[PDB]
Design an enzyme around this catalytic site. Sequence first.
Site, mmCIF file in Angstrom:
data_model
loop_
_atom_site.group_PDB
_atom_site.id
_atom_site.type_symbol
_atom_site.label_atom_id
_atom_site.label_comp_id
_atom_site.label_asym_id
_atom_site.label_seq_id
_atom_site.Cartn_x
_atom_site.Cartn_y
_atom_site.Cartn_z
ATOM 1 C CG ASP A 9 40.824 45.994 30.536
ATOM 2 O OD1 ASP A 9 40.332 44.878 30.228
ATOM 3 O OD2 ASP A 9 40.780 46.477 31.683
ATOM 4 C CG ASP A 98 45.877 39.172 31.026
ATOM 5 O OD1 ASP A 98 45.946 38.359 31.977
ATOM 6 O OD2 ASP A 98 44.788 39.632 30.614
ATOM 7 C CD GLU A 100 43.567 36.534 33.488
ATOM 8 O OE1 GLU A 100 43.716 37.652 32.950
ATOM 9 O OE2 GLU A 100 42.453 36.115 33.845
#
EC number: 3.2.1.17
Length: 217
Positions: A9, A98, A100
């Site tokens: 990634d 994503d 986080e």
Amino acid sequence: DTSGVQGIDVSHWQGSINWSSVKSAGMSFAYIKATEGTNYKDDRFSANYTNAYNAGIIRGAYHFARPNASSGTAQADYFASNGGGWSRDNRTLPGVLDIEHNPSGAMCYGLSTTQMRTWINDFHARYKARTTRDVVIYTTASWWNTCTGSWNGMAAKSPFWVAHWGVSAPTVPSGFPTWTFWQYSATGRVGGVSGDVDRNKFNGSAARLLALANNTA
Ligand SMILES: [Cl-]
Ligand SMILES: [Cl-]
Ligand SMILES: [Cl-]
Ligand SMILES: [Cl-]
Ligand SMILES: [Cl-]
Ligand SMILES: [Cl-]
Ligand SMILES: [Cl-]
Ligand SMILES: [Cl-]
């Protein structure tokens, strides 16, 4: 764990990437950063997305969430209109949320566990309405358990991409039945990328990866 189906990634931090080299290195897939928050767009996204596809890499895009900045619905639409779109072509993975540790503020973005659950549910609902796909959730076990209060609500809705570096096998929160992708290193090496690269393992066969890309499994 470098065995089986492997991928990487990347974001603009990885600079100029030679995707034919990434493919010849043995990588099968890649997730590429597209958007963040409400108005950030990765400058290398278009080229990476194009070149990874041309090199034969099964690739998808990811959105770095900033839940404090707007609703889950709003960021899902922003993502879907700026890199997160999906269609069946043997080489496009479902988009990634994503979500986080906040890089600039309270780690859970000022949302209670209930508000965060709603935010994630809203992002999932809108991303699915836009693309027909169940968004893949990338996060750490710590963040998931802390900020959602160990929520099991996405177990049947989103594949899990767990970030857990340097271990032989990843720790999975009870809220997910298993992991689909696992980021096991942020300091790897891969031909075509200069410097540290994030390395991922896919939990399944090459056929299962293609099925995930084409929405046939
Ligand atoms: Cl290696
Ligand atoms: Cl190589
Ligand atoms: Cl937004
Ligand atoms: Cl915040
Ligand atoms: Cl899906
Ligand atoms: Cl729960
Ligand atoms: Cl495992
Ligand atoms: Cl490596």
